[PDB]
Design an enzyme around this catalytic site. Structure first.
Site, PDB file in Angstrom:
ATOM      1  N   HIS A 137      40.105  46.480  42.916  1.00  0.00           N
ATOM      2  CA  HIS A 137      40.441  47.738  42.245  1.00  0.00           C
ATOM      3  C   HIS A 137      39.195  48.550  41.868  1.00  0.00           C
ATOM      4  O   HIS A 137      39.361  49.678  41.420  1.00  0.00           O
ATOM      5  CB  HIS A 137      41.419  47.562  41.074  1.00  0.00           C
ATOM      6  CG  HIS A 137      40.829  46.936  39.855  1.00  0.00           C
ATOM      7  ND1 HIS A 137      41.177  45.641  39.457  1.00  0.00           N
ATOM      8  CD2 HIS A 137      40.022  47.474  38.912  1.00  0.00           C
ATOM      9  CE1 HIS A 137      40.514  45.422  38.328  1.00  0.00           C
ATOM     10  NE2 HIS A 137      39.805  46.488  37.963  1.00  0.00           N
ATOM     11  N   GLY A 155      35.963  47.380  31.482  1.00  0.00           N
ATOM     12  CA  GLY A 155      34.654  47.113  32.067  1.00  0.00           C
ATOM     13  C   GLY A 155      34.380  45.630  32.272  1.00  0.00           C
ATOM     14  O   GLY A 155      33.406  45.269  32.935  1.00  0.00           O
ATOM     15  N   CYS A 193      36.287  43.598  33.976  1.00  0.00           N
ATOM     16  CA  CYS A 193      36.774  43.119  35.278  1.00  0.00           C
ATOM     17  C   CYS A 193      35.653  42.628  36.156  1.00  0.00           C
ATOM     18  O   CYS A 193      34.575  43.213  36.137  1.00  0.00           O
ATOM     19  CB  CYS A 193      37.586  44.200  35.970  1.00  0.00           C
ATOM     20  SG  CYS A 193      38.916  44.858  34.947  1.00  0.00           S
TER      21      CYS A 193
HETATM   22  C1  LIG Z   1      41.524  47.703  29.873  1.00  0.00           C
HETATM   23  C2  LIG Z   1      41.218  46.250  30.159  1.00  0.00           C
HETATM   24  C3  LIG Z   1      40.990  45.337  29.129  1.00  0.00           C
HETATM   25  N1  LIG Z   1      41.027  45.685  27.772  1.00  0.00           N
HETATM   26  C4  LIG Z   1      40.749  43.973  29.486  1.00  0.00           C
HETATM   27  N2  LIG Z   1      40.748  43.520  30.744  1.00  0.00           N
HETATM   28  C5  LIG Z   1      40.969  44.404  31.718  1.00  0.00           C
HETATM   29  C6  LIG Z   1      41.192  45.754  31.475  1.00  0.00           C
HETATM   30  N3  LIG Z   1      41.406  46.625  32.570  1.00  0.00           N
HETATM   31  C7  LIG Z   1      42.564  46.727  33.258  1.00  0.00           C
HETATM   32  O1  LIG Z   1      43.551  46.030  33.048  1.00  0.00           O
HETATM   33  C8  LIG Z   1      42.575  47.828  34.296  1.00  0.00           C
HETATM   34  C9  LIG Z   1      43.624  47.554  35.345  1.00  0.00           C
HETATM   35  C10 LIG Z   1      44.796  48.297  35.396  1.00  0.00           C
HETATM   36  C11 LIG Z   1      45.792  47.992  36.312  1.00  0.00           C
HETATM   37  C12 LIG Z   1      45.631  46.929  37.184  1.00  0.00           C
HETATM   38  C13 LIG Z   1      44.447  46.196  37.164  1.00  0.00           C
HETATM   39  C14 LIG Z   1      44.260  45.083  38.063  1.00  0.00           C
HETATM   40  N4  LIG Z   1      44.084  44.191  38.753  1.00  0.00           N
HETATM   41  C15 LIG Z   1      43.441  46.519  36.255  1.00  0.00           C
END
Ligand SMILES: Cc1c(N)cncc1NC(=O)Cc1cccc(C#N)c1
Ligand SMILES: Cc1c(N)cncc1NC(=O)Cc1cccc(C#N)c1
Lengths: 304, 304
Positions: free
Chosen positions: B41, B143, B145
């Protein structure tokens, strides 16, 4: 989201760990620049620990008696000196992996990471608080002496603890990196009283703010309190009295959540008087005091 | 003595973290040999995440669109491929800090360390369990990921997790290092059901053994039980049914303490039916399930 008992990344400290042997005793040493620091009791046999005269024991030792091994590599010891309860072994080679570092003496109630080591090899990393009575509730076995506690500010490692001893109660005692014990302890095989401990009030309040930030809000109530009233409750429950200095360092969390510090004190007062009622806060069924307000902000903002 | 939620030393993994940017999205990558692994992603904008066609999105990208930076140093990307939910960016330089490593897919109930990272920089390390429903209760912000989970066997890092997503419930989802999600999750901005979770029974029993080893013995009783009887209680309290495979891996702890596994099951049965009565076990007011029998033995013997 989520809130964990997070330790600093230990890589910078792993690069400094060495094994130190003197006679039949082996423990861990910390190699920074051209000096290796380790507990002075590396010069003792088990018999010596009952009432050691460290000055006389060290006089029987020469540079060549201190065997220092950095994993596989052998260091040449060109000087030795005792400073308080640590030995400083001057080596002819500066550690190429020496990070930017400082030696700091932390205050009771502050937190730090410990890199538990055996025979100069790192085994694990965990976060803990220096208790108000200057002990740490670590996880240490025989051979862990010389393992260090530290904090990291960007690229700078601030070493604050070197492990020396396990008390008969199973809690741990050690020194700053100048060899001064935290607390009343001495490096001798004698039963030693750790003071009455208290709960680190400002850290519990910081952790209640971390809980609200992460969605655990059931403990919030319609009440407020005063520092005086809250401190009567803190006294009864063996919590540190809250001061304006503690309220001041909680300001960023109060601002982020919009919950005034004394209103959070009223939630803490109700939790002390009523308990958790079979509920949890951030996966804990007790009031957690091993996160400072700085740790909560760092974890909730993602500082590297 | 003492028992902590200990993580593996993170140094070997810190040396592998890089920042990966594609367009306006930046996340973490893992650089092992001449390949950088990261969540696919990274090629999406926020608008793309609603229903991404990753094959079409990746076709619009060239090697020069993937910016990889190892702290300060820029890597030259000479190939790119998508494998399940990960991208593999071939670089012209093998990471000089690549530890001995393996890619493993862990089972639910197993534990691992996470090195939380932001912009390619490590921020902290914590230990956690893969829940029976294939989520992890981590501490991750936007961030994070690309941050990875791992275990270490002497000098070998077994990478088992790469972080991808936070569910609307605040729990975390990710993949093995071949990009296969753990659990039913997909990399899309859609609400997704995590299954019903259970408590990892064998880990709670391992932790009760760790408690007895460290002196917390109040929960031991005069009773015994059977696997069938214990499993009726496990069912009622949403615990995993105990099998002979679990009893087998508890053998070393049963042998060390002299407490037969079914006798420890009777202590666990009484704690489930009566609660803790306002008492604690290893500093916890709840039954802890994030330590496997292997973790308890490793921590209680000092393995490096
Ligand atoms: C925002 C966040 C936080 N707090 C912790 N961990 C991760 C995030 N990022 C997300 O989840 C962004 C996202 C959205 C939709 C699908 C996928 C996948 N695969 C990834
Ligand atoms: C045995 C052990 C454990 N389990 C954890 N941590 C440490 C140990 N080692 C000891 O306490 C050995 C010892 C004895 C008397 C004084 C001093 C000092 N200073 C050190």
């Amino acid at each position: 989201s989520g809130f964990r008992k997070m330790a600093f990344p230990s890589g910078k400290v792993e690069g400094c760990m060495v094994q130190v042997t003197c006679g039949t005793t082996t423990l861990n040493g910390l190699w920074l620049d051209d000096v290796v620091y380790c507990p002075r009791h590396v010069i003792c046999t088990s018999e010596d620990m009952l009432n050691p005269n460290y000055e006389d024991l060290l006089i029987r030792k020469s540079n060549h008696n201190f065997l220092v091994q950095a994993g596989n590599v052998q260091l040449r010891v060109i000087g030795h000196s005792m400073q308080n309860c640590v030995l400083k072994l001057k080596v002819d080679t500066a550690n190429p992996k020496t990070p930017k570092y400082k030696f700091v003496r932390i205050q009771p109630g502050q937190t730090f990471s410990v890199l538990a080591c055996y025979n100069g090899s790192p085994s694990g990393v965990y976060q803990c608080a220096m208790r108000p009575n200057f002990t740490i509730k670590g996880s240490f076995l025989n051979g862990s002496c010389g393992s260090v506690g530290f904090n990291i500010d960007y690229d700078c490692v601030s070493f604050c603890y070197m492990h020396h001893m396990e008390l008969p109660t199973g809690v741990h005692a050690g020194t700053d990196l100048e060899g001064n014990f935290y607390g009343p302890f001495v490096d001798r095989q004698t039963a030693q009283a750790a003071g009455t401990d208290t709960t680190i009030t400002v850290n519990v309040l910081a952790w209640l703010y971390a809980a609200v930030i992460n969605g655990d809000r059931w403990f919030l109530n319609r009440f407020t309190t005063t520092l005086n009233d809250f401190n009567l409750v803190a006294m009864k429950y063996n919590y540190e009295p809250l001061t304006q200095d503690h309220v001041d360092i909680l300001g960023p969390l109060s601002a982020q959540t919009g919950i005034a510090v004394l209103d959070m004190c009223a939630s803490l007062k109700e939790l002390l008087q009523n308990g958790m009622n079979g509920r949890t806060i951030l996966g804990s069924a007790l009031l957690e005091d091993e996160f400072t307000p700085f740790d909560v902000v760092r974890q909730c903002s993602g500082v590297t």
